[PDB]
Design a protein around this ligand. Structure first.
Ligand SMILES: CCCc1cc(C(=O)c2ccc(-c3ccccc3)cc2)ccc1OCCCN1CCCc2c(OC(C)(C)C(=O)O)cccc21
Lengths: 271, 271
């Protein structure tokens, strides 16, 4: 029923505000200059990278860990710490999706293990434009061209996220749209190894109707936006399959890699 | 007006019904036997627990989880699971408390973070008699004797809850009283790290007013029941500190991990 779906939508948005400190609206205010506080330091090369860390003089122990390597490894290493925080944030949000915590525990685990990267790329787009990406709570900006320039495999991790972002961003979703899209991703009844598919699909279906109504109301002039958004779920899946192949390239071409423990769990025997 | 205070009580009883499908009225019927028809499986020992494990598996699988560990640890993990579910119900009931969703978003989160435990023990009492507690939406009944017999750290967890429940249950609160009492507890202006204290005390003051009038009307022969009930709100703080201090034992001294990343961030600065 409409009132039910509108109230589902407001719940997820409210909870999305509570779970994700840097929302699209705040990322864009920062991207755009509209903010009034502190303009982000841009990293375009080795020297400004050095200075970007070396900002640690009127800056602090930047929540990540410590670095005994080179540029390409060090950047991939700062990506891991951020994706670990994103996973925590996304798990905290999932628990608020009505019906999620009442599911079989193994199913909750599998839903998260498969959904979490799709959602990291979805929301990474929020922080991106065609020239670069906001990093460190919006205190920095790394250029697309710098990330793309990185030695073979590392450089290969970056570009396809930017090509995705540019296209997803042209859909002009805002946070309240995104909040339902991401819950829809989480509640995917076709993740490998699910014990109890139907009660997951029943929830997804109801999220789907809510996302539908939210796009009609919020973007009345935008034709077939709902479909165009669900088409994006396959751009997402292909980013993940690509990312995973690139991860295998990293075991071969690199010395001691071993991701953060929680990410190794995520990647352990994945699709 | 008193009529506005009655309308508030009434509005709160209605949200409460919606949020919490197993009510005190329903649970007391099951602990006794009103229209005696669909009796919970009783779990009184280690054998009956297994008999009752693969009883909800001689049907299917939506579990807290199956045989894969030590029994005292499975029971304690099953409680954690139930308590992550219960935080979702409380969270929703809170949105229906007037003024709550207009509070600072961060204060909302802090009110729930610290109010939630006190509310879980208050509501657990509705499911308990002197001899046992209804579990799994009222389908099981686990005996206090059996909980008490588990090995030394786990054998002491539930017992303080039973002792509180017996003293609390002797007050003979119904759901309509508890709906108000639960709302007073949430709106406690003394939780650590509250930004705006005053607006919270102003809502709690109108809840206190409604609570006081409810009990005066519903329980005219209980002299000073308002007061005895506020006094219970110290008895609860103490169960909660003792519970929080027993989570330090488990974490420091026990091997098994398979915990819930929603309670674990909740115990920062907690009494
Ligand atoms: C979800 C994380 C996305 C992401 C995060 C950041 C940062 O937080 C960051 C912050 C600080 C530094 C830094 C490091 C050294 C000196 C100065 C600054 C570097 C990076 C910077 C760029 C960035 O995205 C660009 C492309 C996204 N990307 C490509 C590299 C691998 C990767 C990724 O890989 C790991 C292995 C973490 C994974 O599978 O989870 C996960 C999600 C995105 C992603």
């Amino acid at each position: 029923e409409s009132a039910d779906l509108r109230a589902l939508a407001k719940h997820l948005y409210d909870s999305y505000i509570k779970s994700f400190p840097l929302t699209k609206a705040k990322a864009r205010a920062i991207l755009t200059g509209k903010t009034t506080d502190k303009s982000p330091f841009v990293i375009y090369d080795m020297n400004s990278l050095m200075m970007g860390e070396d900002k640690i003089k009127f800056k602090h122990i930047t929540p990540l860990q410590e670095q005994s390597k080179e540029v390409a490894i060090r950047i991939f290493q700062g990506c891991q710490f951020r994706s670990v925080e994103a996973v925590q944030e996304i798990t905290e949000y999932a628990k608020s999706i009505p019906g999620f915590v009442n599911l079989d525990l193994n199913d909750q685990v599998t839903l998260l293990k498969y959904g979490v990267h799709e959602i990291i790329y979805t929301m990474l787009a929020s922080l991106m434009n065609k020239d670069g990406v906001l990093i460190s709570e919006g205190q920095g900006f790394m250029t697309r061209e710098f990330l793309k320039s990185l030695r073979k495999p590392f450089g290969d991790f970056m570009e396809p996220k930017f090509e995705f972002a540019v296209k997803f961003n042209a859909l002009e979703l805002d946070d309240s749209d995104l909040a339902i899209f991401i819950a829809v991703i989480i509640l995917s009844g076709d993740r490998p190894g699910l014990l109890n598919v139907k009660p997951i699909e029943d929830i997804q279906d109801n999220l789907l109707q809510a996302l539908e109504l939210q796009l009609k109301l919020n973007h009345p002039e935008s034709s077939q936006l709902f479909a165009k958004l669900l088409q994006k779920m396959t751009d997402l899946r292909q980013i993940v399959t690509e990312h995973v192949q690139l991860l295998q390239v990293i075991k071969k071409t690199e010395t001691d890699m071993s991701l953060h423990p929680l990410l190794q769990e995520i990647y352990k025997d994945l699709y």
